[PDB]
Ligand SMILES: *[C@@H]1O[C@H](CO)[C@@H](O[C@@H]2O[C@H](CO)[C@@H](O[C@@H]3O[C@H](CO[C@H]4O[C@H](CO[C@H]5O[C@H](CO)[C@@H](O)[C@H](O)[C@@H]5O[C@H]5O[C@H](CO)[C@@H](O)[C@H](O)[C@@H]5O)[C@@H](O)[C@H](O[C@@H]5O[C@H](CO)[C@@H](O)[C@H](O)[C@@H]5O)[C@@H]4O)[C@@H](O)[C@H](O[C@@H]4O[C@H](CO)[C@@H](O)[C@H](O)[C@@H]4O)[C@@H]3O)[C@H](O)[C@H]2NC(C)=O)[C@H](O)[C@H]1NC(C)=O
C-alpha cells in the first residue's frame with residue numbers, strides 16, 4: 001500500500017483565496033506527474049490540474065486555468081494548489097492522485113489517490129454592515145457600533161464631516177465568526193444633548209453600503 | 219519597489235492545519251534565501267522558517283520545529299508554509315521575507331517584505347454540539363437534531379440500542395458558521411406514542427461530550 | 437478536446453446481476469481509457485488501467501472493452517460491495533477528463549415519500565435559533581425536490597438538504613431538509629410548510645404547521 | 650541564540666536623542682540588524698552588520714556594538730520615528746529577533762474617562778447583545794479592563810481595540826466589546842467594567858442594570 005494526504009481545505013468566500021497541499025507516504029513523488037481532481041456536489045469527477053515529473057510542464061482544466069496555480073516540492077514530497085479568487089462552483093471535494101503504474105510510461109492512469117479534502121466556497125463575496133447607536137447615558141460620550149461587515153474597510157464620519165473634534169474611530173476587530181466590527185465614538189458637551197443632532201455616516205465601499213444613523217439619548 | 223504578496227490567511231482551530239503562500243513580482247526568487255516571519259500578540263516579531271537558495275537548507279524556530287514545513291517553487295516564483303497542528307500561540311500576522319541587499323552576500327538581513335496576511339488560531343479544537351428534540355406530530359416519525367459542532371462525528375442511538383428498525387441518521391451538513399449540523403429520526407407505530415418513552419443517547423466523540431434527550435409529544 | 441459521454445448516468449440492478457456500462461469519446465483517442473469505482477465520500481479506486489486491461493489485485497468479476505471511440509465496462513454478477521459509482525477516464529500525458537459517473541444502485545419498484553414536518557423545539561428557540569426540519573422518510577428512486585414556504589412565500593437560499601444512501605433492509609432513499617431562521621425572523625410568521633415532488637407522487641405533497649399551535 | 654531588548658517602551662519628546670539597547674545571551678560578533686515597524690505594516694530594515702546604514706535610511710539612525718551589547722541611536726526624533734523597533738540576529742540560513750521596543754511621545758499621566766454603553770434595543774431584538782466600555786484619552790498605553798456580570802468575572806467573551814496616539818494630545822483611547830446572545834444577556838442584571846491604569850489610584854467601575 002501507498003498513501004497521499006491532502007490538507008488546507010475548509011470554508012471559503014466567493015472571490016476570496018485558499019491554498020491546498022498534498023503530502024505522501026511510503027513513496028517519493030520525484031518520479032511522478034502529480035494531479036489534482038475534484039468531485040463537485042453534482043457527483044461527477046473533474047480533472048483540475050497537473051504538474052509533470054521534473055516540474056517541467058504545468059497544465060489545467062479550462063474552468064480553473066489562469067485562476068489556479070499548481071506547484072511542487074520533489075525533496076520533502078509535497079504538491080500545492082493556489083486557488084486565487086474562487087468561484088461558487090469551485091466548491092468540491094479536492095483529491096490529489098499520482099499518475100502511475102508498476103512500470104511507468106509517457107502515458108498512465110491514476111493508480112493511487114488520497115482520501116480527499118472538502119472545500120466550500122460560500123457565495124457571500126462582501127457583507128454590508130449593521131449599525132447600532134452607542135447612546136449617551138460636564139462631558140458626555142456617544143457613538144456608533146458598526147458590526148458584521150466583510151471585507152475591510154469601513155469609514156465613519158460624524159455629521160457629514162462637520163464634527164471632527166473629539167472623534168475616535170477604533171481599529172476593527174476580527175470576530176470568531178470571520179466578520180469585522182468597529183466602534184466610532186465622540187465626546188461632546190452634555191449641554192448639547194438636547195439641541196444638537198449627532199449622525200454617524202458609515203460607508204462600506206466593498207458592499208456599496210451607506211448608513212446614516214442618528215444617535216440620541218434613550 | 220519590489221513586489222511580494224502573501225495569500226491563504228484567516229481563521230483556524232487549535233489542532234487544525236493551514237497552508238500559507240507568497241508570490242512575487244519585480245524579481246525572480248531563485249537567487250534569494252526566503253523566509254517566513256510572524257508578529258505574536260505582544261507586538262514583537264518571531265522568525266518562523268528559512269529556506270535557502272536551491273532548497274538546500276530549511277531551518278525553523280523551536281516553537282514550530284517539526285510542526286510546520288516551508289517549501290519553494292522558483293519556476294513560478296512562489297514560497298509556501300504548511301502549518302499542521304496549529305496552537306493558540308501561532309495567532310499572529312505572517313509575512314514572506316526576502317534575505318537580501320543592493321549586493322547579495324553569504325549572510326544578509328531581510329530587505330523586501332510582503333504586506334502580510336493575518337492568521338488566527340481559535341481555541342475551539344473540539345466544539346461540543348447543541349442537541350434538540352424533533353417531536354412526533356398509523357405510523358409516526360420522531361427524532362433528535364444536532365447543531366454547531368466541530369470536528370466530526372456526532373454519534374446517535376435510540377434508547378441505548380433497544381430501538382433499531384426504521385432508524386435513520388443523516389449525513390452532516392457544513393453550515394455558513396463553518397460548523398456541522400445533522401439529524402437522527404425513527405418511525406414507530408402511532409399507538410405507542412403514549413406508552414413508549416423514546417430517548418436518543420448521543421456523543422460528540424472528539425470532545426467526548428455525552429448527551430441524552432427524551433423525545434415525547436409536545 | 438475530448439469530452440466523455442458515459443451511459444447510463446444511473447444503472448439499477450441487484451446481487452448476482454451481470455451489468456454493462458458504456459463511455460463514448462466525443463472525438464477519437466488511441467484506446468487511452470481507464471475505469472474507477474467510487475464509494476460515497478471516498479477516494480476512487482482504479483479497476484482497469486487501459487481499456488479491457490484489469491489492474492492487479494482487482495476482483496475477477498470486472499471486465500471492459502475499447503474501439504478508439506466507443507468503450508465499455510462490465511461486472512460479472514454484482515456483489516453488495518459493487519453498489520457504488522463508476523467513472524470512465526480518458527488520460528493524456530499531462531491532462532485527463534472523466535465521464536459523469538454511472539451510479540450503480542440496488543433496484544426496486546417506485547415508492548413515494550412519506551413526508552413529515554417538525555417545528556423547532558422550544559429549548560432551541562429560546563437560545564435564539566429556529567431549525568425547521570422536513571423528513572422524506574423512505575422513497576425510490578433517489579431524485580426528489582423539496583421547497584419551503586413561509587406564509588405561502590416560496591423560500592430561497594435558507595435550507596440545507598442531505599440524503600441517506602440506500603437502506604439495508606428495503607434499499608429506499610431518504611431526504612431531510614433543514615430550514616434555518618433566527619428566533620426573531622421565525623416569530624415573524626405563522627405557517628411553516630414543505631412541499632415535495634417525486635417519481636411516485638401524482639401531485640405535490642405539502643406538510644405544514646402553524647407556529648404556536 | 651536568544652536576545653533581550655530594553656526598554657520595552659521608550660517615551661520621549663520630538664527632537665530628542667534616544668538609544669534602544671539589545672543584549673545577546675552569547676557573542677554574535679556584528680551579525681545583528683535593526684528594523685522599524687509601523688502599526689499594520691511589514692517591518693522595514695534600518696541597519697545591518699551592527700552599524701551599516703541601509704541605502705536611503707536617514708543619517709539620524711545609527712547602530713554600534715559587537716559581541717553581546719548592541720545599541721540603536723536615533724539622534725533627533727522626528728514624528729515619523731515614533732514606531733515599533735526590533736534588534737535581529739541573522740546567520741547564513743537563519744535568524745532570530747528580540748522582544749522589540751515601542752517608541753512613543755511622552756506626556757503627563759492622564760487617567761481614562763470611562764463610559765459604559767448597554768446594547769441598543771434594535772440589536773437586542775435581533776438576538777445579540779454587544780455592551781461597549783470606552784476608556785477615553787489616557788496615558789500611558791497600558792490599561793486593563795475587566796468585565797463583571799452580577800459580580801462574575803468574564804473571560805473569553807470580549808475583544809479590545811486601541812487607537813494610536815492622538816495627534817493633538819498624545820493620549821490613547823480603548824474600546825472593549827462584551828458580546829452575548831439575547832438568551833445569555835437577559836439571564837443577569839448588572840453589567841460592570843472595572844478599569845485599572847497608572848493614572849488611577851484604585852480601579853474605576855462603570856455599571857448599569859439591565860432594563
Ligand atoms: C534531441 O532529442 C532529445 C530526446 O532524445 C530531446 O530532449 C527532449 O526534448 C523534448 C521536447 O522539448 C522533451 O519533451 C517534453 O517534456 C515535457 C516534460 O516531460 C517530463 O516527463 C518525461 C517523462 O517522464 C515520465 O515517463 C518516464 C517513462 O517514459 C518515467 O520513467 C518517468 O518516471 C516519468 O513518469 C511519470 O510521468 C508520466 C507522464 O510524464 C506518467 O505517465 C507516469 O506514470 C509518471 O507519473 C521526463 O523524461 C522529462 O525529463 C526531464 O526533461 C527536461 C527537459 O524537457 C529536463 O530539464 C529534465 O532534467 C529531465 O530530463 C520531464 O520530466 C513534456 O511535458 C512535453 O509534453 C508536450 O508538451 C507540449 C506543449 O509544450 C504539448 O503540445 C505536447 O502534447 C506534449 O504534452 C514534452 O514531452 C523531453 O523532456 C526532453 N528529454 C530530455 C532527456 O531532455 C531534445 O530536445 C532534442 N533536441 C533537438 C534540438 O531536437
Ligand SMILES: *[C@@H]1O[C@H](CO)[C@@H](O[C@@H]2O[C@H](CO)[C@@H](O[C@@H]3O[C@H](CO[C@@H]4O[C@H](CO)[C@@H](O)[C@H](O)[C@@H]4O)[C@@H](O)[C@H](O[C@H]4O[C@H](CO)[C@@H](O)[C@H](O)[C@@H]4O)[C@@H]3O)[C@H](O)[C@H]2NC(C)=O)[C@H](O)[C@H]1NC(C)=O
Pocket residue numbers: 249250251270271322323324
Ligand atoms: C569545481 O568544484 C569545486 C568544488 O566542488 C567548486 O567549488 C565550489 O563552488 C560552489 C559554487 O561556486 C561554492 O558554493 C558557493 O560558495 C560561495 C563562496 O564560498 C563560501 O564562502 C563562505 C564565506 O564567505 C564560506 O563560509 C563558505 O564555506 C564558502 O567557502 C558562497 O558565497 C555561495 O553561497 C551560496 O548561497 C548564497 C545564499 O544567499 C547565495 O546567495 C550564493 O549565490 C550561493 O548560492 C556558495 O556556498 C562552493 O563553496 C565551492 N567549494 C569550494 C570552496 O571548493 C567549483 O565551483 C567547481 N567549478 C566548476 C567548474 O563548476
Ligand SMILES: *[C@@H]1O[C@H](CO)[C@@H](O[C@@H]2O[C@H](CO)[C@@H](O[C@@H]3O[C@H](CO[C@H]4O[C@H](CO)[C@@H](O)[C@H](O)[C@@H]4O)[C@@H](O)[C@H](O[C@H]4O[C@H](CO)[C@@H](O)[C@H](O)[C@@H]4O)[C@@H]3O)[C@H](O)[C@H]2NC(C)=O)[C@H](O)[C@H]1NC(C)=O
Pocket residue numbers: 028074075076273274275276
Ligand atoms: C543521483 O541520482 C540519485 C537517485 O537515483 C539521487 O539520489 C536522491 O538524492 C536526493 C537529494 O539528496 C535524496 O532526497 C533526500 O532524501 C532524504 C531522506 O532520504 C532517506 O529516506 C527516504 C524516505 O524518506 C528514502 O527514499 C531514502 O532512500 C533515504 O533512506 C531527505 O531527508 C532529504 O531532504 C532534506 O534535504 C533537502 C535538500 O538538502 C532539503 O530540501 C529538505 O528539506 C531536507 O532537509 C532529501 O529529500 C533522495 O532520497 C535520493 N534518492 C535515492 C533513491 O537515494 C542523487 O541525488 C543524484 N546525484 C546528485 C549529485 O544529484
